[PDB]
Write a protein that binds this DNA or RNA. Structure first.
Ligand SMILES: [Mg+2]
Ligand SMILES: [Zn+2]
Lengths: 65, 131
RNA sequence: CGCAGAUAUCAGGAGGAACACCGGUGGCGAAGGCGGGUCUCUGGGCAGUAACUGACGCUGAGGAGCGAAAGCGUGGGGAGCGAACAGGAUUAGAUACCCUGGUAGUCCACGCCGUAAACGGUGGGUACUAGGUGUGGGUUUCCUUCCUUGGGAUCCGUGCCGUAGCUAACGCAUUAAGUACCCCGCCUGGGGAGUACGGCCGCAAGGCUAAAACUCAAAGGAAUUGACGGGGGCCCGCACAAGCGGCGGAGC
RNA sequence: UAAUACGUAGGGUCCGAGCGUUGUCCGGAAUUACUGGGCGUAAAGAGCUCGUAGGUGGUUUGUCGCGUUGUUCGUGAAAACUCA
RNA sequence: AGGAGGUAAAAAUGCCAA
């Protein structure tokens, strides 16, 4: 079990402008990574997913690159 | 909700006696205190004591266990419950295990053992059976 | 279906429906049920403080509301799928399974119907009865770096394993099918039958309430020992496979 | 075609001025379970809530004596039932 | 110890005692 990075006090604030922050959590195929592989908590994973979907909508991330 | 505090007393006692606990803590009422007095007098419980809690008094009863781990109480059953209430005449006083147990009856003179009520000639509502 | 230029590949356009990865034995909801994104309106729950009211609680006959899918009415829309319906194929026969098409329907708006293996096959409320290990939401003491699923305590939710106890058995076991109290619904052998008649509701399909005659000496639940399987696993035998020689044809 | 189950015999058992059959009720039947049953799979939890009447009710002080309990009087005809 | 892929044309019936 590895620690959820956002739950740490140093944890960066989650938002969909940050491109590299989400890049760390989307695979090379353009898909969202899983909780078991990433390690973040349920709430932070949900925030990640919504942010990635929004960034995909505003064309800052590709659909299935 | 809590509709029968006396049956709650009896089932707490029964469960603790079946689980071999030594002490039992209840919310306190005068009727429960009198029932514990009768149980102590008839030798079913060792001793009982009232103690003060945040919201009121509390009944703590110590259970009696035989030297060979035998229990001092074989059964514990209520009789006159809300809904069906049981009243008994002086000439119809219930007997438990052919008189080897005790039936606690509420009378105008107070809580009495069935032997006491038959001796005094009064009758009333039968609360519970102990054996 | 193509050779009248198909399938394939590239570019552009039209339209409908469902929302990959996140996404699970995880969340919310009373139950049906609910996951593309954003905004607006809106319901419930949980934790801590305990400032307020001071038993105002529980259940609930009839009743009222909600209630998957299919189905119905009116008006839209209709890509994919697809009852019915057509051919093809299989077969003794295929009104089936398989293939190629394909209407209602599935979608939207506003209304009907009111049934499901609508299931945890487990009505609601309350108190008590050994524990162990996951996970979801929130509070807090101690190691404390005070980074940390560090570890503990407490409340609420959801799984697994497990004593006592219960059960016919399987199993349930603090989320009880355990020990108890209150209120409600229901059962009284299998068919006939959730059917007939009567009544209420419905546009209809139908739903709800609900018998009797006659007939049977059983219908059932759980578990055991065999047998069987066009169930699985491991093995053999001139069983197959690789070969040699026949029988089935002729006369006796 | 080798019946203690049919018919007849012997023998036996039970009753006896009776002995059997039918009809009807109660029992056995805890099989309508008040005493004294149940609903996961045997029959049986309404698909789920809200709420009317009803049922049910936490801790404690005082009062009433309706329920409850004790005693006494009247009544509960006779016959019936039970004891002498 | 963990784990992936592949794997069936058609095949009906059999009387009621011991
Ligand atoms: Mg969030
Ligand atoms: Zn986190």
């Amino acid at each position: 079990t590895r620690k959820c990075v956002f739950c740490s006090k140093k944890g960066q604030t989650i938002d969909y402008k940050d491109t590299a922050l989400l890049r760390t959590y989307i695979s090379e195929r353009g898909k969202i990574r899983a909780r078991r592989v990433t390690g973040n908590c349920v709430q932070h994973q949900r925030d990640i997913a919504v942010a990635v979907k929004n960034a995909r909508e505003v064309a800052l991330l590709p659909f299935g690159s | 909700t809590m509709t029968d505090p006396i049956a709650d007393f009896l089932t707490r006692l029964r469960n603790a006696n079946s689980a071999y606990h030594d002490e039992v803590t209840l919310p306190h009422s005068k009727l429960k205190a009198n029932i514990a007095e009768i149980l102590k007098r008839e030798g079913y419980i060792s001793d009982y004591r009232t103690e003060d809690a945040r919201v009121g008094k509390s009944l703590v009863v110590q259970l009696k266990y035989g030297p060979s781990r035998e229990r001092s109480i074989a059964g514990l059953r209520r009789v006159s419950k809300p809904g069906l209430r049981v009243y008994a005449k002086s000439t119809n006083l219930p007997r438990v295990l052919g008189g080897l147990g005790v039936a606690i009856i509420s009378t105008s003179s107070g809580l009495l053992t069935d032997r006491q009520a038959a001796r005094q000639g009064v009758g009333g509502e039968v609360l519970a059976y102990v054996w």
